[PDB]
Symmetry: C4
Subunit: 229 residues, 4 copies
Amino acid sequence: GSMYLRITNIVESSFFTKFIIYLIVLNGITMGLQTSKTFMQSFGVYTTLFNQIVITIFTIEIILRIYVHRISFFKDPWSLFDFFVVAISLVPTSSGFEILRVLRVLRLFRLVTAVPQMRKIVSALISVIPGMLSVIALMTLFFYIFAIMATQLFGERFPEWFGTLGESFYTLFQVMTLESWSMGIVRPLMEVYPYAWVFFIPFIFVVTFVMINLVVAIIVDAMAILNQK
Amino acid sequence: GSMYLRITNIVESSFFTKFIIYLIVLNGITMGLQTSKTFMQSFGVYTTLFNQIVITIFTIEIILRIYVHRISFFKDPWSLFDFFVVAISLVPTSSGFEILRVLRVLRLFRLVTAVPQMRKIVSALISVIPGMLSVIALMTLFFYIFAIMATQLFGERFPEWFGTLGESFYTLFQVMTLESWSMGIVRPLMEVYPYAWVFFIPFIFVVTFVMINLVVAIIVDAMAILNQK
Amino acid sequence: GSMYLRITNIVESSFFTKFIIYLIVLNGITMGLQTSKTFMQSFGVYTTLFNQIVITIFTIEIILRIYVHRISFFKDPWSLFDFFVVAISLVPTSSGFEILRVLRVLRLFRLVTAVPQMRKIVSALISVIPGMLSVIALMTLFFYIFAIMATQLFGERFPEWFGTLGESFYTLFQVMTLESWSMGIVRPLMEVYPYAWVFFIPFIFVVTFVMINLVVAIIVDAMAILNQK
Amino acid sequence: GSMYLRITNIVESSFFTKFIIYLIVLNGITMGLQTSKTFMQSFGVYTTLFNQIVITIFTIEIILRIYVHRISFFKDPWSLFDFFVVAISLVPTSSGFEILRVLRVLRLFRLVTAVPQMRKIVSALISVIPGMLSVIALMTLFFYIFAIMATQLFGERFPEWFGTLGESFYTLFQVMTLESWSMGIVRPLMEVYPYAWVFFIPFIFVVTFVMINLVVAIIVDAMAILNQK
Ligand SMILES: CCCCCCCCCCCCO[C@@H]1O[C@H](CO)[C@@H](O[C@H]2O[C@H](CO)[C@@H](O)[C@H](O)[C@H]2O)[C@H](O)[C@H]1O
Ligand SMILES: CCCCCCCCCCCCO[C@@H]1O[C@H](CO)[C@@H](O[C@H]2O[C@H](CO)[C@@H](O)[C@H](O)[C@H]2O)[C@H](O)[C@H]1O
Ligand SMILES: CCCCCCCCCCCCO[C@@H]1O[C@H](CO)[C@@H](O[C@H]2O[C@H](CO)[C@@H](O)[C@H](O)[C@H]2O)[C@H](O)[C@H]1O
Ligand SMILES: CCCCCCCCCCCCO[C@@H]1O[C@H](CO)[C@@H](O[C@H]2O[C@H](CO)[C@@H](O)[C@H](O)[C@H]2O)[C@H](O)[C@H]1O
Ligand SMILES: [Ca+2]
């Protein structure tokens, strides 16, 4: 129909999508003043009020551009995100956790969707991830096998650090980033277990070698693309 | 006029600008001995005295080379800097803060202006910054959205770290550099909030992925320029 | 013989090796639930039972594919690994240390052997190591010479950090990763030994210069290979 | 003369220089067992005895190869080093400091001189340094100007960290490596000086931008050489 075209040249319009970018920037400043108990005690009304207006508008416009583009709307990753942070946001307060009240702030990520220069650079960042998969595979297997070892070795005398398989995972991740791996983790262990450095000096070495190579992978792959294009 | 040319071939002279480089190096050694309470108690007079002589000379010469080059002086970034650290310096003591007394030391950055090899390498460093803008954009939006979350989640029971939106920003920046993110920030939070690692392990991951890519961006862009030039 | 070919087209089969990949994934989930004292108190029987079944199967199949390929089996690094983590695993409990009971978990690294995409990426990582050898040589010599110095200088008044040649090695390695090198190591030393920063500021500088170059070595070597291939 | 050629084909011989490599490796193992108070109490005699034999041999051979090559010996950086760690070593004990007794261990760096594969990789590492000079220049000027500021701002209430111009330099260097810059340096300062992060968040930013670029400089320069050669 032609009323269809009337609605498409509204919704595909520059001004329509530019308007909801201003609605994004407005609701980001509001989002930020909500973290002020002073502001909320004066303008807590006008503010949360403004937060409900922007959410109906995004649902009015997610129903509108779900109509303009019908099923094609759903094979698009960026539209799915706008649908799934509008709806994560669409849940009302005092229902569920507060964790949903805070995840409503995820709707600021609609700025990355509605802005072109931003969906470009995010396309770059995710374009990189297919290549990293084999090393992130190898990498995980390593953290798994070494978390099992570390729990079996240390989980009984250092339970806050190696009790769970998970507690072990976390500490190891922490050690990988060299966050206090020595004065804080390994040195305290050599007070009970003297040859513990045999477990962590190998460990530090291997995940640092693999991080270097993961990054050289990003660097050469990109260079190869540039060279071939 | 020809008295104009007399003043231009003075001010565009090698010796003129080389002389104010020695005045820079002299006033840097003086600048440094001023931080010695011993030195200041003997030669505090001769010293601050020397600091007032170099500042009139730079204003004599900023009035001179503002005359030689008239308006063109102002469309030049390096001359604006010399004008704005001479004048930040031109404010007298006991007026305002001490923060202006110390910012007078910024006039040592005139060494980067008056030396060619130095304005070259600074040109390299700033030439890099136009490219970084889209990722620094994305990056900020992320720190904002996640500071709001983190205040809403933790600002009441950990007020020194998540009370303000700003307190949150700082801690997050701190966590990004892996400065005691674990034994110091996240582990203390898991004493009250057990599933806090769900907020920071994602967070550490995303800003490390984006830092890697920002740096691979610098590396490939530069490589591309070299290849095409 | 043709019974030989009957056994080879069994053992070189897709399904045979795919089956022992499922046996790997099964014995990894089991491996992981063993670290649960709750799980072990109910299903400790069924579980360790399952661990003995998978080890006979791997020895049945290491005797099988040592037959199919006879001596060639042994000039292959990945088969040697499967032979040496099956046999490290083949030792029975209550004989030796517990350190062998835990190293049995190394048999999960059979997933990297039995999966193609995984032996590829490990081939990449080890392919990189021949080049790094001269800098790892230089590097070690440096840690040695500087551990000897550091013990001679500090081992008597700081025995937990510089008593052994080994204690010195460890601390230095720790300092190299910038793990609390300052508030934790060097600042406490400047309470007794004031000009200690002369030993560690040079040291931090040299191993950071050499790490940068080691990584630029990986990056240019790989780039050169890409360019020439 | 021909006795000259007799001495040159001795000193330029493979076996001559290979022999003093074994003397290097021997005196490195000895060097290392000297840090053992147990070893020194049994074999302290045989050991230090061995240390005096190797030093006469190196002076016999530094007088020999100073004769074979006369003045050309001195325009060679690697021979100057062998002359200046033999002579730093030639000073006798109980004269001067112990700091000279320990610097005798520097003579192990003769292994890098006497081995070809080693003087190669050190040639690589130093070949890189001419390029880094302009950024290390800019870099220093920055640490200087900002150490002066930081002493003027904080040296009176935090004297162990900002009292000297030097104390300031050290702390800043420490902050640059992100070693406890937050929970340890800047957070304690915001207890007295609340807007201190304005001094260090800019500071952390600028030296991290410049480190990234210094390393991209190494990476592209090397790539350019590879491409043009
Ligand atoms: C936009 C969507 C993004 C989806 C996120 C995808 C995540 C992909 C994982 C990549 C992140 C790796 O995670 C991060 O790796 C860095 C690598 O610098 C490691 O960090 C450590 O390793 C490096 C090696 O490079 C050490 O030299 C360094 O001292 C330290 O930073 C940590 O292990 C982890 O903090
Ligand atoms: C001359 C004028 C200069 C104007 C300044 C322009 C500033 C531009 C911003 C670039 C600086 C980024 O700021 C800095 O990023 C580094 C990236 O190494 C991060 O630092 C961290 O991230 C890296 C990833 O590379 C981790 O692997 C690593 O363990 C840690 O160093 C921090 O987040 C921050 O300290
Ligand atoms: C798959 C089999 C693998 C066999 C393992 C082979 C090991 C080869 C050794 C390479 C590992 C080097 O070991 C690791 O080097 C990193 C380099 O990032 C150093 O780590 C440090 O150096 C870097 C320089 O890049 C600093 O800028 C940084 O703040 C810090 O991470 C440490 O010294 C060590 O943790
Ligand atoms: C063989 C003779 C050698 C002569 C020595 C020549 C020295 C030349 C100076 C290069 C060394 C720079 O010194 C070192 O720089 C590293 C850069 O990784 C910095 O270290 C820091 O900066 C990086 C940026 O890359 C941060 O992202 C990172 O978290 C941290 O490691 C420190 O400021 C310092 O420890
Ligand atoms: Ca730290």
